Ligand SMILES: O=P1(O)OC[C@H]2O[C@@H](O[C@H]3[C@@H](O)[C@H](n4cnc5c4ncn4ccnc54)O[C@@H]3COP(=O)(O)O1)[C@H](O)[C@@H]2O
């Protein structure tokens with residue numbers, strides 16, 4: 001768990017992303033942990049050429065402009081520097097991979113590198129990268145996300161926004177990008193990551209949006225790390241910097257941009273992981289097959305499964321089922337009862353009955369893996385089939401459990417149902433920290449209660465629902 | 474004399490002002506020597522309220538914005554502060570008076586005080602002050618200059634541009650002022666005095682003009698004082714500041730704004746005085762009356778006066794004559810010969826014959842004073858009339874000389890012509906430093922040669938012309 005402000009932000013932004021109305025605004029700071037050297041370090045020889053010192057200079061745009069002025073406006077050196085630095089092959093950080101995995105269809109970047117593009121490519125996602133006005137007129141077919149590199153690309157250094165002339169001519173040359181960013185800011189919920197909010201173009205666009213929409217501006221989010229006490233600095237200077245950052249944060253709200261203050265930069269990764277987990281765990285994989293329903297009678301167990309599926313649908317969960325013999329019909333009935341109040345939404349219930357025959361069993365493993373990949377939580381019930389006239393614990397449920405563990409999915413074996421479910425519950429309880437690291441007391445209590453045969457249908461269903469909810473929320 | 478760069482700027486800007494195509498852009502720094510306390514000093518309690526320190530802050534606009542943010546956007550305190558400070562009664566500095574005396578019809582000010590307006594009022598000039606969009610639609614009749622207070626007026630503190638919100642909404646609210654300033658920058662030659670070129674609105678306007686006109690931007694001038702070594706600073710920091718200022722100066726050239734580097738702020742007053750002197754001394758008051766032309770014959774002296782007036786007209790001088798008996802006709806003939814090559818331009822020759830009779834002599838003194846006020850250089854020739862049949866040295870020429878001295882006009886008595894002119898030359902040579910303080914060797918030689926009877930017409934005329942030119946140029 002994190003700070004209550006962080007928890008509220010995680011809930012709200014997960015809600016925004018699940019509606020596919022969220023955009024990510026990534027600054028250069030999101031790529032400073034990857035391995036690219038700092039822009040000030042690159043400009044250090046540039047500053048030394050014109051007799052300045054990059055450490056004593058805070059406005060690097062004016063520094064680059066001065067360098068260009070000293071060379072009759074020529075940018076060849078700076079173009080070569082940025083091409084040499086930001087085109088290097090660097091391993092992607094976890095933040096880029098998580099952002100690629102999230103269902104985010106809009107990225108706006110002020111960085112010249114192609115880390116977002118590579119992260120989207122490695123997720124088998126089609127990325128429509130735009131850094132030219134002409135490129136706005138063409139859309140890639142079946143694209144997953146669109147990346148607006150509003151400061152240019154690394155492979156086109158001459159069109160990168162680096163000097164004051166570029167910023168001064170941006171409003172004329174790149175006006176369609178300004179219009180697109182204004183439309184996204186008024187129509188989408190943005191998350192600013194790695195952005196210092198010192199960019200003149202972004203200040204201009206935000207001021208225009210504020211002038212247009214007054215107090216009815218759309219709420220956006222930013223992630224900013226708190227000020228850290230430098231070794232040379234004194235306590236008074238640190239407190240002054242903290243107060244300055246607080247005043248900076250309120251001016252941002254002047255633009256209806258709420259700032260989340262983070263202790264360190266790994267909290268960005270933690271927040272992204274939490275959002276990804278909240279999105280992924282909303283889909284539950286219901287597994288099991290039952291000819292004999294352990295201690296419970298047939299009708300009682302059927303009603304239990306029906307009401308469990310109805311509660312899962314009611315709690316805004318998407319059920320994926322393999323249509324196991326003896327369990328599939330009743331989860332289908334529960335979903336139908338919950339939804340027919342109507343049509344079957346494709347997202348709420350995904351049914352994947354296994355092909356029957358010799359041909360089907362060849363691809364059964366890949367079918368099972370594809371079915372499980374859609375989910376983030378696996379729920380196992382019973383696990384008994386009939387082979388030679390006798391009830392024998394099934395083997396498909398064990399394979400599903402193995403696949404779920406290999407995919408880092410949460411496993412919720414209900415031991416009260418018995419058979420392979422009870423075996424899996426015993427296995428999980430044998431090594432609880434391996435499957436649920438850092439579990440709370442309530443989580444342990446719910447997991448232990450999952451193997452209670454004295455619970456009624458309602459009590460067991462409520463225990464399962466609460467366990468799945470604390471896993472997801 | 475000043476630096477050759479300063480001399481070239483003085484010549485070029487005097488040429489621009491004499492064509493009435495010059496405008497003055499005055500910053501707040503032009504009013505910092507008058508007695509108004511610094512804006513940082515005013516914001517010091519404002520900074521202390523929000524927990525900041527105005528000495529550690531450089532962007533006071535952001536400081537005021539932070540204060541407004543801490544008070545729900547209320548500006549009452551800042552409005553009261555600026556109204557209390559900049560509405561005080563302060564004596565005008567010499568710069569404002571000189572600028573008011575110059576034939577400049579366009580002022581653009583970022584200061585809220587009314588020092589330019591008061592300076593124009595004290596010169597009996599009609600000033601059309603504009604700080605509202607509506608005021609642009611009305612023009613004062615017979616106005617001498619128009620003052621655009623583009624950051625608001627002191628008497629309207631709520632509309633002053635002080636905080637970041639004002640700068641962000643300036644491009645929408647005060648767009649007509651932006652258009653007017655762009656038109657003036659492309660149609661008039663500006664002189665920036667007291668301006669630090671750190672104003673976002675001026676940067677935006679200059680960037681737009683540059684984007685519109687590329688390398689064909691009109692040349693403008695700025696006056697900037699060089700960096701001074703602070704007592705606490707080291708030599709390396711001073712050299713770094715000097716280099717930073719040099720880079721700042723070349724960037725302004727990016728906007729075709731040439732910067733004149735001044736050792737101190739009194740050089741602004743010196744430059745303004747030099748421009749005023751160059752404008753004022755271009756009008757010469759030709760005085761004298763002659764019945765007997767000393768040693769020279771009548772025809773010889775008439776030809777001398779004719780050619781002297783022709784040379785004065787040829788050297789771009791405007792002649793004002795009282796039509797004295799024996800001198801007026803021949804200066805008129807010289808002007809006519811120089812101009813009829815055509816019509817008599819009203820500026821080139823102003824003729825003020827004295828009224829004859831008892832009624833005229835009552836107002837003769839005011840007539841003489843008004844006639845002399847139009848000029849900056851007085852040239853005296855002969856000075857002899859006839860009263861009772863005998864040649865007697867005149868008394869009107871002495872009154873003219875007294876009026877010229879009282880108005881601080883340069884006096885050029887030609888002693889070779891004799892009579893009152895010789896008496897005046899002797900009086901000037903008696904106390905030469907009183908009339909020509911800091912005179913060079915060439916000026917003294919020319920003044921001494923002015924009383925040489927051995928010179929021909931051409932030599933004496935050339936001596937007079939060179940003396941008047943070194944007085945003017
Ligand atoms: O019980 P298990 O070991 O694992 C159970 C899991 O598997 C999947 O459902 C089973 C099974 O109910 C279904 N099935 C239905 N009718 C027959 C049949 N399979 C073989 N038959 C021979 C004659 N009639 C049948 O075929 C799936 C594959 O077979 P297994 O994976 O071996 O089944 C679910 O997702 C369930 O979670």
Ligand SMILES: O=P1(O)OC[C@H]2O[C@@H](O[C@H]3[C@@H](O)[C@H](n4cnc5c4ncn4ccnc54)O[C@@H]3COP(=O)(O)O1)[C@H](O)[C@@H]2O
Pocket residue numbers: 759760761762794795796797798799827856857858867868869870873
């Ligand atoms: O010579 P001065 O002492 O000074 C000379 C200066 O004055 C002005 O011209 C004189 C003078 O030429 C003119 N004037 C012409 N004709 C007569 C006459 N004045 C009296 N008259 C009586 C009978 N007929 C005349 O009347 C101006 C006033 O008379 P004064 O100032 O006394 O003339 C110039 O600017 C000259 O520079």
